[PDB]
Design a protein around this ligand. Sequence first.
Ligand code: HEM
Ligand code: 7VP
Length: 289
Amino acid sequence: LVHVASVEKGRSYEDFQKVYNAIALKLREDDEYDNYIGYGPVLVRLAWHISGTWDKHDNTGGSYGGTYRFKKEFNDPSNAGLQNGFKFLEPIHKEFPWISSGDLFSLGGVTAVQEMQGPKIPWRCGRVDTPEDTTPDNGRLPDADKDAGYVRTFFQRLNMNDREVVALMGAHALGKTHLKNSGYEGGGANNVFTNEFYLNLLNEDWKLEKNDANNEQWDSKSGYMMLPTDYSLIQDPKYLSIVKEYANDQDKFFKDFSKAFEKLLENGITFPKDAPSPFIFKTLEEQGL
Ligand code: HEM
Ligand SMILES: Cc1c[nH]c(-c2ccccc2)n1
């Protein structure tokens, strides 16, 4: 099963920079969402959940086909809450209906990371909408109640190694959990992309507790929280070394996250040899907008 990137007809960098800018301006405008977190974090999670259905063994799932737009995937319990991100992107799509759904969902994540002061994430176009019968079944996204061995095995299906896993998980500095979405609560919140996930893991005083949905989570005195799968990154000695590395080197974290996030968003896609190079979008700040 081969998915060949096909550039939206006649489009180039500046067309996509316009879509980026529209997303970024809306991120700035709709600032009240989720008690003033804004839509950045939910857009990052959306880009990850549309990509994280991929299976390296048969090239099913992944961002290419834009299949989150279909009911089976939209209503995956694992995707509870992401409808907010989809609704945010709807007017963007209406303004730029030439862009494929997969390209828009993935571009939303890249824009959110960058606008939240994260690393630049090179991005490639050419995902093509595929039909409803190509939508992956529910159940391909990871459970949060598990341990390091589960996390390591899970991410092998996405062709991610220990460094890539630990880097990607740094996105859990962003946003918050919501009991009605996932059965986890708390931690306060954040909309600036930093390496704080790793600092919090190493420096806070953590206590395992059972929340009001009867799920276990790690809570700190200062009010932060970690999922069991987050905490597993300091329980496993291989993951712990990498946590320490990123806690001590912001730039290294940014570089590794950028590579892993681009990889995640591109898994399953064959780029022709004459395809355009990856685009690196300017932030609104860099453009004076
Ligand atoms: C073992 C892997 C992972 C597990 C079990 C997991 C689980 C979760 C859970 C349970 C939530 C809370 C959802 C809610 O209640 O609204 C969440 C939020 C979030 N996740 Fe993960 N996740 C994983 C990996 C990732 C990755 C790889 C990324 C992206 C690089 C990511 C990005 C986010 C973001 C940004 C949020 C906050 C969303 C918001 O504020 O609305 N997650 N995750
Ligand atoms: C699983 C997840 C996503 N976001 C967070 C979080 C962010 C800031 C503080 C505490 C938790 N956890």
